[PDB]
Design a protein around this nucleic acid. Structure first.
Lengths: 458, 273, 461, 166, 182, 59
RNA sequence: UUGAACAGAGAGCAUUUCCGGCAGCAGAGAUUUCAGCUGU
C-alpha cells in the first residue's frame, strides 16, 4: 500500500485556500478510498513494466562520458541497434529537416531544394520519394505515416501515403514550422508571416488564425502535455498560444536577440530555449520560473531537443551535445562544458559528437528507441544515445509494432475521440471544474449642538 | 484484456516476496516477464495444453526456488505470509482453467488430480470431490476414472458407503466393460476381507458374506451376456437360425472365458471362506 | 565503460505463431497518457450522443388490442411474460408477451371491467395446478367478481375447463381489486371496501372508514397484510389485516388515482393523483411526502414501481408516460406516440426492463425502460464498454454541453405548450408570493412536500 | 429460469447448464433472435456439463427409437440421474429444457422433481446448440456427428420400413 | 477512410478527408487534368487575370457612359482580348463576365491549339512533342507549354524542319522532298 | 462551456466536487482491477429471471 | 404448522477445539515428499 513511486501517479486537486451531511460524508469517504486504491494499484504496475531504460556509466575516473565515440558505441551495443543507427548520404539537395512519426516507425526527410522522402527507416521500405522542385522547408506526419504535410515555397501541401498530392492549402501563406497535435487532429502552422494557424485535418476546416504581431516566427514547439504552442520571436520572447484566445496565453522574455529553438519536455514541466545571444535557458513551464541560464555558449545553439527520458540535446552547428539530468531545479544541474578541477557538482555533457563537415539542420529523438536523429547538410545520421528513449511504451496509445488492421481501427477510434480545439488550456485539468467566478459555495436559495438637538423633529 | 487482470493479480505475492527479503526487484521482474509470456499464450487464440503444462512446470520451478531461497536466506521453512501458498493456488487455478478449456485430455485431468492429492493437508478432499464430480460428468464412459475415484475414496479414506455408490453409478453408466465388474467384485471382496479381519483382530485382542460378490457376479453374467448379444448383431436381427445359434454360442464362450478369469483371480483372496 | 541500450528483441512484441494475438504492453504513466480530463469528457459526450441516437424504446404493441380502450392491467408476480388486460366493453384477455399474443379472451362482464388481478387460489379442498393453469379474477360495475382459470403452455409435464370457476357477488358495484400475496385473500373496493377469500362466496369483513366510497386498492408486497386505498373524498386510507381494521387516513387536495407500494422498502408507497404529480409517502409518517414527482401536465392516471424499487413509471391523462428516478423528483424519460391516447394503466414488468402501458384507443404497448438498452446477451468487451459509458455519463452529468443533450426529448405540441404556460404561471406566482412575503409579517415557509396534505387523522407528535 | 438443457444427438446425450437466461419478453426482437446465430454470444448462454456417448450403433438405434416415440431410455435415466440435482417434488422443481413436449411426461414419470419446458425459449436454445454443434462439445466425442447422423438415419429408416436384405 | 458505420455516419457527418469546402469542387485539378498543365499555380495565375479583367470591367461599368476615356478603354480591352483570341468575337461587355473563363485562357495555350488543328492527336502527345522541341511559331522554337498564342499566330504553328516526324509524314504521303533538307 | 456553471447538488463546495472528479476511471489510467471496480454499476440484475420483492428474517 | 429418526449437500456462519513448532522411532510411495505415538 505504501508504493515508493506513487507521486508520479498522484493527481492534484482544488483546495479552499468536515461536513454535517451523512450521505455526502460517506460518499466523499468512498471517493477518497477509491482514489487511494486507484493510485496504489496503478503504481504497482512498475513490476509489470517489461524493459529497462538504457544508460552508459563511466566505471572509472579517467573515463569521461562525453569523449565516448559513436563507433565505440556501435561496437559495444547489439547488431539490431547498430543497424538502427543509420546514415543516409544525400548530397545534392539541401540540408535535410528530419521528422519521425510519433511511434518511431517512419522517417520523413525534406531537402531544402526539393527532396521529400517518407520511408520506413528500420526496414528498407520507402513509400514516398517526391521531388518538389521549389524550396521546401519542413514537414510532419499527420496522424499516421499515411498522410504528411510539407511546407513548400509558399503554400503548405498535404500528401497521402504514396505521395499523391491531396491538398494545397490556400491559407498558411508562408509556413516554416509545422507541427501536428495528435489528440486534437490539428495541423499548426507558423512562419515568415506573423501568423499562427490551426487547421483541423479531419474536417478540413481552418480553426484559428492568430496574429503573433511580432514578425516572423523564429522557433516553434508544442507542449505535449497541454497542446499549447510555444513560439519564439525576434524579440527574445517566447509566447504560449491556444486556438481559443486571440492573444497569447503567456509571454515570456526568454533571451536577448531572437529565439533560435524551443523544446518542451513530454511531462510539460520544462522548456529549453536557445537564443541567438549564445544563451541556453531552462524554464519551468507550470510556475514560469527560470531554472537555468547557460550564457556564453561558444556559438549560438541552433537546435534543442528533449528526449522522453529527459535528456537535453543542444546543437551548435557542427556539434551535438547532450546533457543528462539538466532539467532539474538545483544549481548543480546547470549544464556545464567542463568540470573545473573535477567538481562532481557540475553537469558536464552526457555525450557529444562533432559533424565535422557540416552544420546540422535539426534534431529529433527517435521516440521509443535509444537514438537521436540529426538531419544536416548531407542527409541523415542517427546517433546511439543510450539514455534517450522510453523503454516501456504503452501499446494502446501508440505502438511501434502496429499492423495494418491496428492502424485502421486506431485511426477510426482516435478520430472518434478527437478533442475539440476549445479544450486547449494552459492546464489540462480545468475542464471538469466550475468557473472561477460563480461562488465556490453552492447556494441554497435561502441566501438567494444643544439647540439643534431641540430643533430635531423639524 | 484478461492477461492484464491475471498479471496484476500476481502482484501482491511479489509485494510480499520482496518485503520478505528473499527475492530482489530485478529478478522478480524477470519472473514477471516469463509469467507475462505464459499468461498471454494461455488466454490468447491458438492455445495449447502444452502451454498450460509448461506454465505449471515454470510455476512449480519458481516455487521450489522460492522454498530453497527461503531456507537459505531467512532460515525458516515458511514465512507464514502470502508468498508460500499463492503460487500453489496459482498452479491450481492454471489447472482449473486448462481443464475448463480443453476437457478432453485425461493426461491433464490426471495431472490435476495428482497435484491436488499430493498438495497434502493444505488441500480439501471436497475440493478433490468437486473435480472428480465434473470429470466423471464429462467422461462417464471412460471407466478408469470411476476406478480411480473409488480407489482414492477407499484406499485412502476408507469410505465404504461412498465407494459402493461410485461403483454402482459407474455400473449404471457403462454396464458393458468387464473391467468395472471385476474391480467391483475386487472391492467387495476387499471390504468383506477387512470386515472379517477386524473381527479376527478384535477376537485376538479382546451373516454378512461373499454373497454380495456372488450377487454382483450373477448380474455381471446376465448383463454382460445381454450387452454382448446386443453389441454383436448390431442393427437388426436379420440373420437365420444358424447365425442366431452361432451368436448365442459365441456369447456363451465370451461370458465363460470372463468367468474363467474371475476364478483365476478369485483364488488369491484366501482369508474368507 | 559499461553501456546498455534498449533491446526490444521482437519475440515479446510480435508473436511467433500467426494464430495468436499481439502483446499489448501497458505503461500507466500520466506522461504517456496526457489529456485525461478532455479524453473522457469527449467519451462521455459521445456516450450521450450515442444514447440519444440509440433511444428506440417502442418494442411493439401486443395482439390487436381491445375494442374499447384498456382500463385494467395486471401482471402476475411470479411469471415473467404473462399479462392480463381488461377493457371498457367487459372483455378481459390473458397475454403471452413473448409471442405478443393472447392465451385466451373472455367476455367477462357487461359493464366496464373496473379491476382485475391474478391469484394462486389457496383452496383447501382442491390443489392449485399452477404449472398449467393461471388464475385471474376481475370485478366490474355489474356487481360481480369472477375468477377465471387459463390454460398455459409453459411446462410440458402433463398430457381442460378454462373459464369461470366461481362467481362472487356483491349488492353494489365494485371499483378496484387486489389480491393478497398469500392465504387465498383479496380485497375489492367500490361503494365500500370488502375483504374476501376464494372459498367463501361472501365478504369476510367490511373494512370501511366512513360512508364514502373507495376508488382504488393495492396490497403491500412485503408485509403483505397492509392494504391501502383511495377514496373519492380525496382520501388515502391504510388498512391492517392483523387488526382487521383501518389504520390511518390522510386527506389531500385532489383525488388519488392510484397507489403502488415499494417492493424493496415495504413501508413506502407512491400515490398518483389529479394535480399533475406523484407523491412518495412513508407509511410511518404521512404528514409529509418524501418525494414529489412533478413533470406531468395533466392528471396522473397510474403509477408503478420497478421491481428493483429504484424507479417508477407514471402514465397520465396527457397522452404520455414518464419514468422517474426515485431520488430525484423530475422525469428521467418521457414516452409518447401520436397513436397513444390517454394512458390509463401502466405496469413495470418483472424483468425491470420493459414497461407495459394500456391506453384508451384499445392498445397495450411494450416499451423499454432504458430506451438505448438492447436485450441481447453481451460479450465482456461490449458489457465493459456500456458500463464504462454509464459511469462516464454519470460523472460528467452536469456539464452544460452534455446536459443539454441528455435532457433533450421531443414532446408533443400540446404538452410543450402546456409546459411553457405552466412555467410562466409558476414563475408569476413565485413573483407574487415573493412580493407578499416582502411586505407581510408572518408568512410560514411551507415545504413542497407538505403543500398537498390538507389533513391527517391520528396526529403526529 | 431454464436451468438445464437436454440435447439428444446420434453420438449420445448431452446435458448443458444454462448460464444466462435469454430474454423472455424481448424474445422476438432482432438482437435476441440473432444472438443464437453469433457463437461469441451463444457461449455466454450455454455451457456443457455432461456428455454420455453411446455404446455403438445398436444402442444408438435403440435410443433413436425411444427418443422418437417419446420414452426415457436407460442411458437417459443414467445421465439425468447423474446430472440433475435432487430438487423437491412439491416446491421449486429443477427445470430441464427439452425439445419434445411428449418426452416431458416420460421424464417427470421417472424424476418427479423435474419440470420440463419446451416452449419457444427452450426451442431456440435447442436450435442454438443444434446450429453450433461440434463447437460446444470442446472436442469430447469420438466420431464425426454428421457421419453418425448418416448411419443413424439409414438404420432408423430401414428399421421403420422393415427393410429385409433377403 | 473506413466507410463508417451508421451510428458513425450520424455521429460525424461533416468529416471528409478528400474534398473540403475551399476546394471549390477541385476545379483547378479538373481543368489541369483536362488541358494537361505541367506545373501547379498556372491555374491561379490565370484566375488572377480573370479577376483583374472582371474588376476593371466592373469599374469601367462604374464610370458614366459618356466619357471617351471609359469608352476608349473598354473598346481597347475588348479588342486586345479578341487579339489574344481569348474571345471568339467582339460582342457585349457582359461577355467579360459570362465568357471569359480560365478554361478559355487555357484554350489559347499552345498544346491545345495543336490538338485543335490536329497537329498532334492528343494534348499529352502535344506536350511530348513540344518538350522534345519540334514546333515553332514563326521563326523561333517553343520549349515550354506555357506559351499561349495570339489570334495572329494560329497560322504559323508549324514544326521545325529536320523534325523527323515531319519527315515521316512527308514520306507517308511520299511528297518527301529532300532538297529542302527535310 | 467545458466547466460547469455552479456546484451541482449533492456537494457543498467545489473542493468536494473536484475531489470527486480528480481521478480518471479510464482503462489507460487505472489498472484493470481498479477499472472494473470503478465501472461496475450499483444495480446489477440478472437478464432473464423474475425479481421478487424483498423478504427479511422475521421483518 | 411442528417433532422424530434416517439419508445427505458443499451451497452458507462462528471461535480459540486442534494442526500448518522440534526431535526419537517405526510405517508410505517414487534420494525427495508422505503418514502417528512421548515431551519441549
Amino acid at each position: 500500500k505504501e508504493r515508493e513511486n506513487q507521486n508520479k501517479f498522484e493527481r492534484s486537486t482544488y483546495t479552499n485556500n468536515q461536513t454535517k451531511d451523512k450521505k455526502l460524508r460517506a460518499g466523499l469517504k468512498k471517493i477518497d478510498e477509491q482514489y487511494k486504491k486507484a493510485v496504489s494499484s496503478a503504481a504497482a504496475t512498475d513490476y509489470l513494466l517489461p524493459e529497462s531504460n538504457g544508460y552508459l556509466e563511466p566505471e572509472n575516473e579517467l573515463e569521461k562520458t562525453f569523449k565516448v565515440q559513436q563507433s565505440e558505441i556501435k561496437s559495444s551495443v547489439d547488431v539490431s541497434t547498430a543497424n538502427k543507427a543509420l546514415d543516409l548520404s544525400l548530397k545534392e539537395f539541401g540540408p535535410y529537416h528530419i521528422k519521425y512519426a510519433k511511434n518511431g516507425t517512419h522517417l520523413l526527410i525534406t531537402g531544402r531544394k526539393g527532396h521529400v522522402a517518407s520511408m520506413d527507416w528500420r526496414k528498407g521500405q520507402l513509400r514516398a520519394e517526391l521531388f518538389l522542385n521549389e524550396t521546401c522547408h519542413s514537414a510532419t506526419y499527420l496522424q499516421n505515416e499515411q498522410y504528411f504535410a510539407v511546407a513548400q515555397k509558399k503554400y503548405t501541401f498535404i500528401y497521402d501515403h504514396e505521395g499523391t498530392e491531396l491538398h494545397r492549402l490556400k491559407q498558411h501563406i508562408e509556413a516554416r514550422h509545422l507541427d501536428f497535435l495528435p489528440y486534437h487532429y490539428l495541423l499548426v502552422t507558423a512562419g515568415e508571416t506573423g501568423w499562427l494557424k490551426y487547421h483541423d485535418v479531419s474536417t478540413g476546416q481552418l480553426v484559428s488564425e492568430l496574429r503573433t504581431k511580432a514578425g516572423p516566427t523564429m522557433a516553434m514547439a508544442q507542449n505535449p502535455w497541454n497542446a499549447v504552442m510555444h513560439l519564439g520571436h525576434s524579440n527574445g520572447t517566447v509566447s504560449l498560444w491556444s486556438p481559443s484566445m486571440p492573444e497569447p496565453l503567456v509571454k515570456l522574455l526568454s533571451a536577448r536577440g531572437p529565439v533560435n529553438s524551443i523544446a518542451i519536455d513530454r511531462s510539460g514541466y520544462y522548456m529549453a530555449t536557445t537564443g541567438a545571444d549564445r544563451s541556453m535557458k531552462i524554464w519551468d513551464i507550470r510556475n514560469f520560473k527560470q531554472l537555468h541560464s547557460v550564457e556564453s555558449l561558444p556559438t549560438p545553439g541552433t537546435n534543442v531537443s528533449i528526449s522522453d527520458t529527459g535528456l537535453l540535446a543542444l546543437s551548435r552547428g557542427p556539434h551535438v551535445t547532450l546533457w543528462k539530468d539538466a532539467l532539474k531545479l538545483s544549481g548543480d544541474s546547470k549544464p556545464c562544458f567542463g568540470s573545473m578541477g573535477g567538481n562532481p557538482h557540475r553537469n558536464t555533457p552526457y555525450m557529444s559528437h562533432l559533424f565535422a563537415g557540416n552544420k546540422v539542420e535539426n534534431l529529433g529523438f527517435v521516440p521509443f528507441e535509444d537514438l537521436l536523429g540529426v538531419g544536416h547538410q548531407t542527409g541523415i545520421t542517427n546517433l546511439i544515445v543510450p539514455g534517450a528513449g522510453e523503454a516501456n511504451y504503452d501499446a494502446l496509445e501508440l505502438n511501434p509494432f502496429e499492423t495494418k488492421k491496428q492502424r485502421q481501427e486506431q485511426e477510426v477510434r482516435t478520430l472518434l475521440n478527437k478533442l475539440p480545439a476549445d479544450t486547449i488550456t494552459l492546464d489540462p485539468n480545468s475542464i471538469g471544474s466550475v468557473d472561477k467566478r460563480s461562488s465556490t459555495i453552492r447556494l441554497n436559495a435561502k441566501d438567494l449642538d444643544v439647540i439643534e438637538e431641540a430643533l430635531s423633529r423639524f | 484484456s484478461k492477461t492484464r487482470y491475471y498479471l496484476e493479480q500476481c502482484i501482491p505475492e511479489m509485494d510480499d516476496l520482496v518485503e520478505k527479503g528473499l527475492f530482489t526487484k530485478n529478478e522478480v521482474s524477470l519472473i514477471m516477464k516469463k509469467r507475462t509470456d505464459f499468461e498471454h499464450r494461455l488466454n490468447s487464440r491458438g492455445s495449447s495444453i502444452n502451454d498450460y503444462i509448461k506454465y505449471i512446470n515454470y510455476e512449480s520451478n519458481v516455487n521450489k526456488l522460492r522454498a530453497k531461497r527461503c531456507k537459505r536466506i531467512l532460515q525458516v521453512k515458511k514465512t507464514n505470509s502470502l508468498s508460500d501458498w499463492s503460487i500453489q493456488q496459482r498452479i491450481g487455478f492454471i489447472y482449473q482453467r486448462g481443464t475448463n478449456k480443453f476437457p478432453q485430455d485425461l493426461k491433464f485431468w490426471a495431472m490435476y488430480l495428482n497435484y491436488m492429492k499430493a498438495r497434502g493437508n493444505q488441500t480439501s478432499y471436497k475440493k478433490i470431490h468437486n473435480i472428480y464430480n465434473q470429470l466423471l460428468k464429462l467422461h462417464p464412459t471412460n471407466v478408469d476414472i470411476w476406478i480411480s475415484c473409488a480407489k482414492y475414496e477407499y484406499e485412502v479414506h476408507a469410505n465404504f458407503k461412498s465407494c459402493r455408490n461410485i461403483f454402482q453409478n459407474g455400473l449404471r453408466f457403462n454396464p458393458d466393460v468387464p473391467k468395472l465388474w471385476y474391480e467391483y467384485v475386487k472391492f467387495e471382496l476387499n471390504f468383506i476381507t477387512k470386515l472379517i479381519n477386524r473381527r479376527k483382530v478384535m477376537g485376538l485382542i479382546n451373516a454378512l458374506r461373499g454373497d454380495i460378490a456372488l450377487t454382483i457376479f450373477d448380474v455381471c453374467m446376465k448383463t454382460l451376456g445381454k450387452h454382448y448379444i446386443n453389441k454383436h448383431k448390431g442393427y437388426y436381427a436379420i440373420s437365420d437360425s444358424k447365425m442366431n445359434i452361432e451368436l448365442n454360442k459365441e456369447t456363451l464362450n465370451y461370458l465363460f472365458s470372463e468367468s474363467l478369469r474371475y476364478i483365476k483371480l478369485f483364488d488369491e483372496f484366501l482369508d474368507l471362506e | 565503460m559499461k553501456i546498455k541500450t534498449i533491446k526490444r528483441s521482437a519475440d515479446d512484441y510480435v508473436p511467433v505463431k500467426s494464430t495468436q494475438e499481439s502483446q499489448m504492453p501497458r505503461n500507466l504513466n500520466p506522461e504517456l497518457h496526457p489529456f485525461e480530463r478532455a479524453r473522457e469528457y469527449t467519451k462521455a459526450l459521445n456516450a450521450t450522443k450515442l444514447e440519444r441516437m440509440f433511444a428506440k424504446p417502442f418494442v411493439g404493441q401486443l395482439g390487436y388490442g381491445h375494442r374499447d380502450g384498456v382500463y385494467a392491467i395486471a401482471k402476475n408476480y411470479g411469471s415473467l411474460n404473462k399479462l392480463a388486460t381488461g377493457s371498457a366493453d367487459g372483455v378481459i384477455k390473458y397475454w403471452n408477451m413473448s409471442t405478443r399474443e393472447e392465451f385466451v379472451s373472455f367476455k367477462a362482464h357487461y359493464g366496464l371491467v373496473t379491476g382485475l388481478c391474478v391469484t394462486q387460489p389457496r383452496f383447501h379442498d382442491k390443489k392449485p395446478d399452477l404449472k398449467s393453469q393461471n388464475f385471474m379474477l376481475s370485478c366490474s360495475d355489474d356487481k360481480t367478481v369472477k375468477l377465471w382459470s387459463i390454460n398455459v403452455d409453459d411446462y410440458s409435464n402433463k398430457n381442460n375447463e378454462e373459464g369461470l370457476i366461481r362467481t362472487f357477488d356483491g349488492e353494489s358495484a365494485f371499483q378496484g381489486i387486489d389480491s393478497h400475496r398469500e392465504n387465498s385473500t383479496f380485497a375489492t373496493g367500490g361503494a365500500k371496501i370488502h375483504l374476501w377469500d376464494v372459498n367463501r362466496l361472501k365478504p369476510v369483513s367490511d373494512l370501511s372508514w366512513g360512508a364514502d366510497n373507495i376508488t382504488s386498492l393495492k396490497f403491500n408486497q412485503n408485509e403483505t397484510d397492509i392494504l391501502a386505498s383511495t377514496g373519492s373524498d380525496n382520501s388515502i386510507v391504510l388498512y391492517d389485516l392483523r387488526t382487521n381494521s383501518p389504520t390511518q387516513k390522510i386527506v389531500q387536495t385532489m383525488r388519488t388515482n392510484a397507489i403502488c407500494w415499494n417492493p424493496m422498502e415495504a413501508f413506502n408507497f407512491v400515490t398518483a393523483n389529479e394535480d399533475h404529480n406523484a407523491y412518495y409517502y412513508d407509511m410511518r409518517n404521512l404528514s409529509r411526502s418524501l418525494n414529489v414527482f412533478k413533470d406531468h401536465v395533466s392528471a396522473v392516471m397510474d403509477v408503478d414501481f420497478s421491481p428493483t424499487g429504484d424507479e417508477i413509471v407514471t402514465g397520465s391523462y396527457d397522452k404520455s408516460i414518464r419514468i422517474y428516478k426515485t431520488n430525484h423528483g423530475h422525469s428521467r424519460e418521457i414516452y409518447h406516440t401520436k397513436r397513444m391516447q390517454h394512458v390509463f394503466q401502466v405496469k413495470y414488468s418483472m424483468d425491470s426492463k420493459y414497461i407495459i402501458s394500456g391506453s384508451d384507443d384499445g392498445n397495450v404497448r411494450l416499451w423499454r425502460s432504458k430506451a438505448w438498452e438492447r436485450s441481447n446477451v453481451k460479450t465482456t468487451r461490449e458489457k465493459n464498454k456500456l458500463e464504462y459509458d454509464e459511469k462516464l455519463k454519470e460523472r460528467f452529468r452536469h456539464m452544460p454541453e452534455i446536459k443539454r443533450i441528455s435532457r433533450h426529448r421531443h414532446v408533443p405540441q400540446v404538452i410543450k405548450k402546456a409546459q411553457e404556460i405552466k412555467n410562466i404561471e409558476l414563475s408569476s406566482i413565485k413573483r407574487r408570493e415573493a412580493n407578499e412575503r416582502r411586505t407581510r409579517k408572518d408568512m410560514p415557509y411551507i415545504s413542497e412536500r407538505k403543500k398537498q396534505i390538507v389533513g391527517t387523522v391520528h396526529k403526529y407528535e | 429460469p431454464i436451468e438445464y438443457l437436454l440435447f439428444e444427438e446420434p453420438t449420445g446425450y448431452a446435458v448443458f447448464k444454462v448460464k444466462l437466461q435469454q430474454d423472455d419478453i424481448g424474445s422476438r426482437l432482432k438482437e435476441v433472435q440473432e444472438q443464437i446465430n453469433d457463437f461469441g454470444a451463444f457461449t455466454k448462454l450455454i455451457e456443457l456439463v455432461s456428455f454420455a456417448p453411446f455404446k455403438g450403433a445398436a444402442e444408438a438405434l435403440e435410443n433413436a427409437n425411444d427418443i422418437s416415440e417419446g420414452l426415457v431410455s436407460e442411458s437417459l435415466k443414467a445421465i439425468l440421474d447423474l446430472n440433475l440435482p435432487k430438487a423437491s417434488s412439491k416446491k421449486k422443481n429443477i427445470t430441464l429444457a427439452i425439445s419434445d413436449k411428449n418426452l416431458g411426461p416420460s421424464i417427470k414419470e421417472e424424476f418427479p422433481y423435474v419440470d420440463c419446458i419446451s416452449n419457444e425459449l427452450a426451442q431456440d436454445l435447442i436450435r442454438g446448440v443444434r446450429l453450433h454443434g461440434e463447437k460446444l462439445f470442446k472436442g469430447l466425442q469420438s466420431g464425426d456427428l454428421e457421419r453418425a447422423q448418416l448411419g443413424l438415419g439409414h438404420a432408423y429408416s430401414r428399421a421403420k420400413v422393415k427393410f429385409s436384405v433377403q | 477512410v473506413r466507410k463508417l458505420k451508421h451510428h458513425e455516419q450520424k455521429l460525424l457527418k461533416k468529416v471528409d478527408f478528400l474534398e473540403w469546402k475551399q476546394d471549390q469542387g477541385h476545379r483547378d485539378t479538373q481543368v489541369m487534368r483536362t488541358y494537361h498543365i505541367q506545373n501547379r499555380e498556372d491555374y491561379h495565375k490565370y484566375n488572377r487575370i480573370c479577376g483583374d479583367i472582371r474588376r476593371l470591367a466592373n469599374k469601367l461599368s462604374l464610370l458614366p457612359p459618356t466619357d471617351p476615356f471609359r469608352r476608349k478603354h473598354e473598346q481597347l480591352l475588348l479588342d486586345k482580348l479578341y487579339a489574344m483570341g481569348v474571345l471568339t468575337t467582339k460582342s457585349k461587355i457582359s461577355d467579360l463576365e459570362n465568357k471569359v473563363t480560365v478554361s478559355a485562357i487555357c484554350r489559347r495555350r499552345l498544346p491545345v491549339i495543336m490538338h485543335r488543328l490536329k497537329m498532334a492527336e492528343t494534348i499529352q502527345d502535344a506536350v511530348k512533342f513540344i518538350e522534345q522541341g519540334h514546333v515553332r511559331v514563326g521563326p523561333n522554337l517553343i520549349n515550354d507549354p506555357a506559351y499561349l498564342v495570339t489570334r495572329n499566330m494560329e497560322d504559323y504553328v508549324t514544326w521545325v524542319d529536320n523534325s523527323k516526324i515531319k519527315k515521316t509524314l512527308l514520306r507517308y504521303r511520299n511528297q518527301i522532298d529532300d532538297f529542302d533538307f527535310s | 462551456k467545458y466547466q460547469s456553471s455552479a456546484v451541482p447538488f449533492p456537494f457543498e463546495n467545489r473542493e468536494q466536487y473536484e475531489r470527486s472528479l480528480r481521478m480518471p476511471i479510464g482503462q489507460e489510467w487505472t489498472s484493470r482491477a481498479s477499472h472494473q471496480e470503478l465501472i461496475k454499476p450499483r444495480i446489477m440484475t440478472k437478464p432473464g429471471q423474475v425479481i421478487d420483492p424483498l423478504k427479511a428474517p422475521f421483518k
